[PDB]
Ligand binder design. Sequence first.
Ligand code: KNG
Ligand code: MG
Ligand code: ZN
Lengths: 84, 306, 263, 100, 114, 1095
Amino acid sequence: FEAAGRPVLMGITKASLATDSWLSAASFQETTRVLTDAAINCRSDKLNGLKENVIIGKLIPAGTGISRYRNIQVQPTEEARAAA
Amino acid sequence: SGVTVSMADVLVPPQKQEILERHEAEADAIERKYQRGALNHTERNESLVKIWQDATEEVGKALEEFYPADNPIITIVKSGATGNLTQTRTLAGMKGLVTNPKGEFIPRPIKSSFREGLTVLEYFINTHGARKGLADTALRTADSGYLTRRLVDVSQDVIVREHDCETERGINVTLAEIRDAHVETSAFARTLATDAVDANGNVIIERGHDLGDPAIDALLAAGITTVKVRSVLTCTSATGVCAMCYGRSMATGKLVDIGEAVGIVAAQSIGEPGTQLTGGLPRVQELFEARVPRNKAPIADVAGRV
Amino acid sequence: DGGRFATSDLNDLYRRVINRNNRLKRLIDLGAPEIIVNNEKRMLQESVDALFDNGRRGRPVTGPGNRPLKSLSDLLKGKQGRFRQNLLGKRVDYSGRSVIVVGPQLKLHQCGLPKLMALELFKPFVMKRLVDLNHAQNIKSAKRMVERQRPQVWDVLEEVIAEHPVLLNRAPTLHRLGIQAFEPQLVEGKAIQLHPLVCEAFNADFDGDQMAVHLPLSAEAQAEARILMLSSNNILSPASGKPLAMPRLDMVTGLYYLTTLVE
Amino acid sequence: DVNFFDELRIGLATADDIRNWSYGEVKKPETINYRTLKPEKDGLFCEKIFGPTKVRRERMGHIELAAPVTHIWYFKGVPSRLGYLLDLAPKDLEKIIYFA
Amino acid sequence: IQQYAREPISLDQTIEGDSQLGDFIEDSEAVVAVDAVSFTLLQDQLQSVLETLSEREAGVVRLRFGLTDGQPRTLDEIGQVYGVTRERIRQIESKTMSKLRHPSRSQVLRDYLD
Amino acid sequence: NSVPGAPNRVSFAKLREPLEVPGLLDVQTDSFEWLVGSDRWRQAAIDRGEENPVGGLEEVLAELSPIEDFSGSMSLSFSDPRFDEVKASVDECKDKDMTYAAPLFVTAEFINNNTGEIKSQTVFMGDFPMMTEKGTFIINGTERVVVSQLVRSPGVYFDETIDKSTEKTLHSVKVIPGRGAWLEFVRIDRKRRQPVTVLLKALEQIVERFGFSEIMMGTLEKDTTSGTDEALLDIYRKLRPGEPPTKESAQTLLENLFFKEKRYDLARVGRYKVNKKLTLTEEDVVATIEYLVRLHEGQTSMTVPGGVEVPVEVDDIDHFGNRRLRTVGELIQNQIRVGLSRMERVVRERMTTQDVEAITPQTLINIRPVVAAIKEFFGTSQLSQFMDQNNPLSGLTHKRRLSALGPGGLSRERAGLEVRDVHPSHYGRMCPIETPEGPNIGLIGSLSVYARVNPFGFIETPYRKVENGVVTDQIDYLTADEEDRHVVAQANSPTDENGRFTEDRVMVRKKGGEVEFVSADQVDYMDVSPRQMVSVATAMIPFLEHDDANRALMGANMQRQAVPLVRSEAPLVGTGMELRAAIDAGDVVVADKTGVIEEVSADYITVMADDGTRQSYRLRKFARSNHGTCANQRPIVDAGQRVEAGQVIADGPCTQNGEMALGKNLLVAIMPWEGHNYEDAIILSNRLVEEDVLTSIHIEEHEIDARDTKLGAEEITRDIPNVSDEVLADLDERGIVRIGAEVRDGDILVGKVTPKGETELTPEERLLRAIFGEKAREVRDTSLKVPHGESGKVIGIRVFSREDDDELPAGVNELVRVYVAQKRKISDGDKLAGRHGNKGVIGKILPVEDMPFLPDGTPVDIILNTHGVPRRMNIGQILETHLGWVAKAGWNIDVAAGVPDWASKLPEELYSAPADSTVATPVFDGAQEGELAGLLGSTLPNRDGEVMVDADGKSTLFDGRSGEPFPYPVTVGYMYILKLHHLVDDKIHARSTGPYSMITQQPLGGKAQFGGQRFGEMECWAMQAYGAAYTLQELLTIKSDDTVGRVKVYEAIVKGENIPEPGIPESFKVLLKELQSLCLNVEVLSSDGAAIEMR
Ligand SMILES: CC(=O)O[C@H]1[C@H](C)[C@H](O)[C@H](C)[C@@H](O)[C@@H]([C@H](C)OC(=O)C(C)(C)CC(=O)O)CC/C=C(/C)C(=O)Nc2cc(O)c3c4c(c(C)c(O)c3c2O)O[C@](C)(O/C=C/[C@H](O[C@H]2C[C@@H]3OCO[C@@H]3[C@@H](C)O2)[C@H]1C)C4=O
Ligand SMILES: [Mg+2]
Ligand SMILES: [Zn+2]
């Protein structure tokens, strides 16, 4: 968001339902209400949360699933290959 | 170690027969106060409970004075391996006051112990508190699991994304303003937001340090009381949080790795307890859900006289 | 089997909708009083409603025994709703379970695995190496060999199990330390030998307690098991930093008696 | 089978979308023949539309309604999506959709 | 008639506690990984035998059972491709089959019987 | 005692049992005999109570008779139920899979008022399932038990409540009938706050008669309605929203609702609840209102005009006076009533469209509903349960069990926690200690020992009445209500010459019930025995008074979990109930006539009585129980022995010499031993394996049928398409495994084949068929094989064939059942436990050579960790451990001059005792501490003069491994432990690949399908916490749901290649389709924004 606004305190149940991912909120609580509001708003899911990737079978964006870790390139040093 | 359990090893203290009668006699006199009528009936139970729940402590110390320090049952508890002194008191001595199904303490105590064996009525009365406690631990797991699930879902996407966000914001830990009871959970394992300064004066611990145990004592020596510390509350990281703000990983004992999913770790760290919570799970849910407090308390809207 | 038939409630729900749809067509073509046609249209609307979310509006459609039919909404929503019953949680291959027994002679990185359980779990692995060796000419011979528990397979199983980690888990899983990797040890009997130190992490007492075994397959899976989830690498509880594999009841009294000072 | 796609999007399925998806209109409330046990044509398991006895899990059908129908999710869901879109009291909208 | 009168039951029904019946039905045509691989290993073993046979002999055995095309072929239809009387194709088939039964060629496939 | 068998077991009790244990199976038989109206119950009621009794069937028949026409022209009357002798024996029904039943004829009649003709006839209702001598039903061959249900007693219940905000004392009351809507005070059946005045307007001087209450007049003043018809419209609009009232419909509205039998079933219990409180009658509804009025004032007495006064207070629904249990006889009666009511409707419609004079009792009656109601109840109802038969004690507590859930009772979810708690009125009626440990706590409980059920459905308790401070031998069974009306003296009370109290004051229970200490003049009744609160199972735990209710509850639940051992040795230290529980369970052979044995055979035993008449008893030998346990019986008498009526002839599975033997007596050492016994684990001597002491036989029943398919008929045959001759080497001609043959997992029991077509074989396969000359067979192999891990030998085979005139379901030709048994040596991981709630698995079994052993060289059988004993408050297990050693070693008090000061209360028979004597310590008056130490001081040398256990019950044990002794004296003794139905062989599961579900592509769980383990929601959280993305992906894609991924990984493992990259979980694809079916257009999108075909 950073047209004035005030800081808001909201519980976990209410804060989790307000996440930008619609299938995550659907898999949490009240699947029907989330789907109806998401279909109307024509929402789109970036598929960047970790529960989303779990549902579709992707690597979770955490631990060994982070890009900087999975795209590593492993080769022996020029010195090593020679010594054999 | 030659640690076994036997009938002999469970010894009843000999100061217990007199002690009850001493406290028993204090009950016929409050019966005089009830028979006199100067005090109400609920006050009769109250004065009865306070005197009876005192005798429990007297037989407690009485029991301990009699036991030899090498008694196998006491050795089990002394070592910290397993057991409670409350359980030992219920084994030999007296059970004490038990719960009524409605929840109020019975004025009548169970003078017998499971060593001497309870009677028909003494055993029956105890079933109320024994079953009611066994059903409390039955639905305790269902509410804790539902709480853990909401914790996980609200925090699952929180992971460390960068080594440092370079922010200078932080929070002040109390740190022994004698030592504070809980600096292990508040000051220990944090990273300094700013340099630790002594008057006027000397810098004893530089910022961006892990605050190990030796740091505390050294700090503690300098006469400092408070410290500004990095926290995920003030972390300015665009996505997730940074390693310096989160601090040490409790498992590795070192700076948190980059990929760590601390949101789930937190939801589980808070979720595993709650089976031990008995002022409990309701209050914890009220806080995280941010509901209007059960019994609202006012806060000052401005500083001044009252 | 038994020749009897079973089918989803959706078929009867679709059957209601298409029946009333066709009857409506029939009423229109004939030409029918507005009361009859309107009555049919209301019935049709209700069937589609029952098809989508049964019971959401008024009386739920029921079958025999008065049990309400399972609507499309009922596939997604409940604990049996896809997100809990299938999507996030689902049964897996290369897994097993059994009751656990104390493993006091084990190292912190080791776990006792019943030879029979370790056999079936690793069944393809032993099948492969036993065909490499000339024990079996083809795969079908290897599979027959393992199923009959031919004595030649035992020494082989040790070779395939060597330095191949396995994940151990006890329900309920409260924290991540509820799942830890171990090095399997072929042991006798049908019980699982568990290191007595990890009991604190698993909350496992040895009274009919059962634990599940999972076999990481891919190189990444085995790497994560040996590196991330190894037993001896996770000592401190990742909540307070305090040690969890720290000795408890039996070993505490033993060391207490050992170091205590007698006058 | 890519396994690496960017977005997942959801929206209201128009009659043409449903019309397009379907590999045929199921016309009869018949499941299978009672003697041959084979799927009945134009019915709910008709091989002509759904597939031969892996595609039987992929193909869909559609039913063409002789009268329009409101999706119960958008009418009865609270708050009433239709009720707020046309500014009709939900109790009023119930009287219209269901012929009261 | 009493078999016809049987009425169906619901898969979505539940049986003891929280377990719907539907989760217990096996998928019969689901590929079983232990057999499909052996089938691939089997068809490679047969590919070896064909190289031992005469080029015309190997071609006949396939077409007769349609290993490459996936469909059998009758003798007269195998005669058109080879331009020979269909009886000759039957003769070539008989001689090649007996040679396939010869001890050396079929020893491997015995174990692949089941 | 008081039993002919009379195995000598010395009792430590100090109070004689005034009343022998009533037949604890009476609860099941009495209720059923009331339903059928047997002559035994008929004469019992003539002797006591009603001059003419009422059979449960006759009671429901008096309700329907007569079925009167609307006009009344034709009236049909039912009467005179008739029962025919049973069709087949219980042993024959369990054999042929048929229900144990007796046909039921009735004597109906149809009278026409117009023509006055009389038409009598005989009507066959149907086969009426009967109750066995063991109190069970056989329904389609399975032995079933009907559990009594706890329900609210129909009637009125006032409950005081405190308003949430206003905190002013509010009073709501409900009237719960047997049928019809319920009224609450006038909110009627889910319509909030109808004016209280409109109800009497529905039915003058309303103010004058009730002028006492000031508030009742305030509500009336606020009521706007005036008149009877004008307000009956006000009450009409809310009962039927949308119907224009009729002048006639307004008046029939109120009377048809609650005051006629058609829509308001007058509760027989309900009619008795309100009559003592003050069909439905309008005057009674008024009497309910003023109690509400009178109870709001707080006045303690209300006098209904023309009726005796009663107290006006709030009712307790949990009080057993207002809470009844529907027993088995009534549970059948209610289902009979439902079947007769739907018959009433068909008879009514049948009358109209049928021609007058063309109808007879037969024409109007189709029984389909009646026998369907009986079949559905026994077949489906929650109350009809599969009898749990693992040990005779379990089957005895399955009967005598009362649970609140089920049809008509509180639901499993909505039941509050206040009802789960124990109640002061429960004492002596329902056991507070025995109840499930899981979510069903307080909902399920077993009947107390001495409890008895009332013909009205309320539990009664035996008491001995005491007057003028003297206890007479009169015994009065008093229900809970009457129990609150007296002062109940405690079971243990000082006893002197005739009946006089030895001590000054008495301990009693009041109407609270609350404990008190009062004068001897006040007491009116006294407890018969001290176990009145305890049930059968709970009363079998020695030193019960020394264990917490938690572990005691556990101990009671685990006794019914034991398994029958091949040896079946009785408990050395037990209680009194050991004997009676075994004989009353019904698994023991009892002689019903005093006589002498004529022949003794393992098959049967015959006894010749004084009458000269022969009785003969056939023995169950290796009968498979419903849970796989062995039901073998064995005779305990020799040829010429003389027996008395009621004596024990043969031992059951878990009995020895007449008393229940659920476990074995083992030598125990309570030292921790090198961590192998740690955290409740256990270590045993290998002797328990070699000597088969904890060995228990387990049997399993397999089944396969050959039916007529559409393509062809299934044939049980020995000819199998593609199999070696060796796998058939144990089959006979028909193709079934031969008797006595072994079975390894995967072996063939019954060879069965089914037609297969069209073949359309593989081109690669058809060639191999041509080479090796094996014709591709026309049929598919579907044979009965042994399940994975299961093993044993074949005991017997049952075969039902269509060719022979056997009865089979339509389409089924042949049925063959194979019974396989196996010996189960006590093994690592098996679950053992004692009677005190202590339990643990067998961590390790050590050779007898290296085991802590006494100076005798006598190795201990079992080693129990010390740390688990003190914390759990089950120290009663330490007591029976000391007494256990005393019993096996014997003793002689050897008084120096007289009984040492501890033995003042000890009976003389307990002074001396030889080795291996059995001991009895009833729960609440058993052995005590002083007596135990003294008995510990009196002990006998083993063989030589040496004594093996000291005065505090410890001995210096020698480490069998090193040889050097153990530093500190270790407590040893004999403890009675049980083998529990949780066994390793049944609980170990392993899976690499196997079948998959049809809808979802995941492996299907359970041992039935070789299933895999479930990786649930919490487990995914742990993996995500670890950050093991690949491990998590692997578990959710290629291990379960990737149709192509899981098959390629198998190919990779076999070829030894790298494991492939996972695909799309089938679960996700199914999710997309399920969303589409909801008219939700979901599109997977790439960076380009182009849709992607999911195929
Ligand atoms: C087919 C059948 O007979 O199953 C029975 C049941 C499993 C067998 O009788 C079983 C032998 C059992 O008696 C023994 C066994 C050792 O215990 C167990 O098996 C477990 C593992 C559960 C517990 C354990 O072993 O630890 C002994 C148990 C000892 C105790 C103190 C105990 O807990 N008792 C017990 C346990 C129950 O759970 C219920 C129960 C119930 C009602 C109305 C009850 O009164 C129950 C009850 O008193 O309502 C529920 C929701 O659902 C109803 C479910 C079933 O009822 C049938 C009735 C009809 O029969 C065929 O079609 C119907 C079928 C669909 O449902 C139940 C009543 C339900 O859970
Ligand atoms: Mg446990
Ligand atoms: Zn930061």
